[PDB]
């Protein structure tokens, strides 16, 4: 009782396009996958909808690999774009190890105003 490559690769392609429909319940999603996709048989849609339900209660959780459903693509862009106030790169004293100070002598940039050793 494993789901084959055709019914998985359909069921991922359904959730691609129509996450705006669908629910946690099976008996709803069964009736969706008639209208969404022309399918020859009855048994096919029960196994497609059976995985479409399975992925929904995985999706109520961290984001599933190899699937992208348009609401999260919008949400990732907002979560991506913004960047917090301040550089966050200024201590601003900046601690530095004893040997790495002697490097900053050898470059020719000691008396930097960034503090030393410990």
């Amino acid at each position: 009782r494993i789901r084959t490559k055709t019914t998985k690769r359909a069921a991922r392609l359904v959730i691609e396009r129509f996450y705006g429909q669908l629910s946690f319940d099976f008996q709803d999603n069964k009736r969706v996958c008639d209208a969404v996709a022309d399918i020859p048989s009855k048994r096919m849609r029960n196994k497609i909808a059976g995985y479409v339900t399975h992925l929904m209660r995985r999706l109520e959780r961290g984001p599933v690999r190899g699937i992208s459903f348009k609401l999260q693509e919008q949400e990732r862009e907002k979560r991506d774009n913004w960047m917090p106030t301040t550089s966050k790169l200024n201590v601003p004293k900046i601690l530095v190890d004893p040997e790495t100070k002697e490097m900053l002598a050898a470059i020719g940039l000691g008396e930097m105003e960034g503090v030393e050793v410990f």
């Binding site: 960047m83 917090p84 966050k88 790169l89 201590v91 190890d97 790495t100 002697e102």
Partner: protein, 204 residues
């Protein structure tokens, strides 16, 4: 005029056992075992890396981070309009035209050649020049123009890619502090993000 050793010597001095090709770029081997990357030569070489990056067309140029520490490579692409590959490489990319995402560049730029031999070696079947942000523990074969760095901690890769993007924009024009900080170029853990999910709804 100008001093970004404040920025650089914040996060990254670190290293492990060094390669023969990388022995010029490094300073004194420190007690413990750690080595000291030289901040003089790392800034100076990024200035050259920008010039090389000054290809005729930005889209043709390819900037492709199989190591997780993959956010910074995205942004470099956006600002410079340079193509990139998330996920694994997929070999036969530069050869093998029958793959869907077939992209011969005019040059490429890498996270690390030690973690990623595969894209480095397929440069050599299609005349592609390679530039690399390796730390000390790094095979240097098949690669021009080393950017001596750290690859291990999350902050080090971000600082360079931001700084590389900045030096390129000054050359090509449309840039004279531009408001994009190097906070945006960092790798972020889900845990790092968890707080980002809070801060969006906190605004509303």
């Amino acid at each position: 005029a100008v001093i970004k050793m404040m920025l650089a010597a914040k996060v990254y001095l670190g290293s492990t056992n060094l390669s023969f090709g990388m022995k010029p770029y490094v300073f004194t081997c420190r007690k413990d075992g750690t080595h000291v990357i030289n901040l003089a030569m790392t800034y100076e070489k990024i200035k050259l890396a920008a010039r090389m990056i000054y290809a005729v067309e930005e889209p043709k140029d390819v900037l492709a981070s199989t190591k997780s520490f993959t956010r910074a490579v995205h942004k470099f692409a956006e600002f410079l309009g340079a193509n990139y590959v998330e996920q694994r490489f997929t070999p036969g990319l530069f050869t093998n035209y029958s793959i869907k995402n077939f992209c011969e560049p005019r040059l490429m730029i890498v996270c690390d050649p030690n973690t990623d031999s595969q894209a480095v070696h397929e440069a050599a079947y299609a005349n592609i020049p390679c530039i690399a942000l390796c730390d000390t523990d790094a095979h240097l074969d098949y690669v021009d123009c080393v950017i001596p760095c750290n690859t291990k901690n999350k902050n080090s890769m971000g600082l360079v890619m931001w700084l590389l993007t900045r030096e390129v924009l000054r050359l090509r024009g449309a840039l004279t502090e531009w408001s994009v900080l190097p906070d945006l170029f960092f790798y972020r853990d889900a845990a790092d993000e968890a707080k980002i999910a809070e801060a969006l709804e906190a605004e509303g």
